[model samples]
Structure formats: structure tokens, C-alpha cells
Target: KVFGRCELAAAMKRHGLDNYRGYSLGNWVCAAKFESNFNTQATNRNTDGSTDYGILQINSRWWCNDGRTPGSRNLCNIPCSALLSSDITASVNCAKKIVSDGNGMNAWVAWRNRCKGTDVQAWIRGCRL
Candidate 1:
């Protein structure tokens, strides 16, 4: 697991999600969806089939640039870069990229709202998603 239960709790504390509500849930779950699909240790390929790596959904290319390679043999666990990486940093940085770029976590929240019947986007913004 990229994040054990203790580590996940620590990560949550790092992002202030330990007491999260509806608003924060969107970004939280959204990031989780994209990153690990809540698996804590999930790796996948993007649509173009490039290597998407690690718990925070950083790609192999990015980690490789940072000098990590996660191939099939090494795919299950997080890359070293991700182990050394911070979810707090990833959450904030990635959310900023999505939010500031005028689209992020939106699709995920929209989906959650549809499925979960919670107006998540508002809460996300209220909680600074």
C-alpha cells in the first residue's frame, strides 16, 4: 500500500481532511479517484497508454524525470519518488492546476452529485477545493 492506514491518516491531517465535509469531499474523492482510485496503491495507463504512476496519480514520466521508473514489475507499489512525495503537496498542487485552469475535480464532483446527490462543487469551493 502506498499509504498504510496510519500514513493515510497522516496524509489526511496534512490536508486537513480529517474533518472534511461535503465541499472538501469532492476534491478529496476527486483526487483520490484520479490518484489511486482510493486503492492507496494503484497504477494505470492514461488514455494514450502512457504510464500513470503511484498513489497521488503522478505519472511515470514525471517520476522518471525526477529519476524513478515504475514498470510492470515495479508497478504495484508506489515509486520511490511517490514514497518520498507528499500527498498534501500533490493535492494542493494538482487541485490548483485543475481549479485555476477552469476545470478540475468538476467532472468527478458532478458525477458524485449525480450518484451521491450532494452538491459537492459548492462545498469544494467553500472548503477551498
Candidate 2:
């Protein structure tokens, strides 16, 4: 919502996210693309009855609260809806924490399922960042 592919790359670089926490910019870009098509308002209902939040599709199981989901850890200390905004600062911050907490981008099933070893460099191929 806030950025197109190239713009997202530039923003990520400005936010120091190109390679934050030992992951590549391609990795983040690829994962975010599949997770939400770069749309911050995106939300998806998982098969296991959980919801994925925002551009990173953070789970209600841990990172945020969806109001109805009880016993959520909410380790990010932010509401799930907060991630669904054009200003992605909170979502990106939570994503960094999630990566540093040992899950890496594997916390996002989108990354594991779609991004791993799949020529993700193209996600930023034309970005002049």
C-alpha cells in the first residue's frame, strides 16, 4: 500500500531493512510480496483458525492480537490492526523482532513456502535503490 516494488526497496533501505538481521533484501521483498502483495491492509485466515496480519502476515498466535484470539502472546505489544496501515514502521519493527528471536523469516510461511531458493533476486531486480 505504501510502496511499489522499487519504492519499497528504497524505503527498506532507508529503514535499514535491506539486510537487517542477516537476511537479504531479496528475501524480505520476496516474502512480503507473497505474504500480502505489498498491501499493508491485507489479511488472511489460516487453515488452523489463526489470522495473518499486515504486509508480513504476522500471526495472531504470537505477534499480535486480533481481538477475538485469546491467550495471544502479542510479543510485539501492538494490535494486529496496527500493522494494516500505510505506515509500515510498526510492522517492520515487529518483523525484525520476529527474525531476531530465532525464527528468522521462517516465521512467515510465505517465505518458507514461496521464497526459499526460488530466484527471489528478481523481486528487487529493477529497483534502483
Candidate 3:
């Protein structure tokens, strides 16, 4: 399902994206806005044969197992199909694991180019825990 702004923020907040791993809720909210426009079903395949899945766009090369990406670690240990579900719990859960790493929020370029160090607070304005 496609998520509204605060709608996504509220869901993510409850899941601990707020100040999660030292990144602001706005960082996650803003990344989803640019990554998949908050659509749970979004998927994009890359030239390297890996793919990005779900709203936060976790990658098949390392995050989820699509059974297609060669040598994919499936680091999230979940099927890529799980990322497309309307429930976002899996997506958020997996992304949290990714963020817990040293890359922090930089794992997703959507965050780097679009959400980083800018007016991320605007993404969460009018939204609360």
C-alpha cells in the first residue's frame, strides 16, 4: 500500500525509527519519501542483478533473499517478497538491522542525496509518537 506522509511517520515511529541507532525519525521518513515514495510494494532491479525492495529500498544483494542475486548474503535472512507486504513491519525490522551497522543511514543513497542533513525535520512535522 502507498503511505501518506504522517501515516508512514506514525508507523515508523512506533517501530522505533525515531532516534533509532542515532538517526532521526526524519531520516527514515525522508528516505522512504524518496526511495519508494512510501509505497510498500515498490521494487527496482539494478544492473548488477540485485534489486531494491520495499519502501526503504533494502537491497537484494545483501539485505533480502530474492533467490536471484548471486552470492547474496540475504543479510536480513528474509525473502524479498516479505518486503512488499503492506505490513511494513518486516521492512522496518530489516532496515533497522541495516542501520545498526556502521553505514548508518548512508546505506541508502536516497537518504544520502535527498534526505541527508537537510530539512528532514519537515518530513516529521505535524507527526508525533
lDDT against the true structure, per candidate, is: 0.44, 0.84, 0.90
**Count of residue pairs whose backbone atoms collide, per candidate:** 2, 0, 0
TM-score of 2: 0.91
| Lowest lDDT 10-residue stretch of candidate 2 | 1-10
lDDT of 1 by residue, 1-129 (tens): 454434454455566553343234444544554456445445565564455544545455433333334342332233434533544455434333434444434534334444345543432343322
Please provide TM-scores, in order, for all candidate models, with all chains considered together.
0.43, 0.91, 0.96
Q: Candidate 2: deviation at residue 64, Å? A: 1.0
Give the number of the best model, judged by lDDT: 3
Give the CA lDDT, 0 to 100, for residue 31 in model 1. Answer: 56
On TM-score, the stronger of 1 and 2 is 2
TM-score of decoy 3: 0.96
Model 2 spans > 4 angstroms off: none
* Candidate numbers sorted by TM-score from highest down: 3, 2, 1
Clashing pairs in 3: none
Error of 1 at 82 (Å): 3.6
Query: Candidate order by lDDT, highest to lowest?
Result: 3, 2, 1
> lDDT for model 3, on a 0 to 1 scale?
0.90
RMSD after CA superposition, every candidate? 8.3, 1.4, 0.9
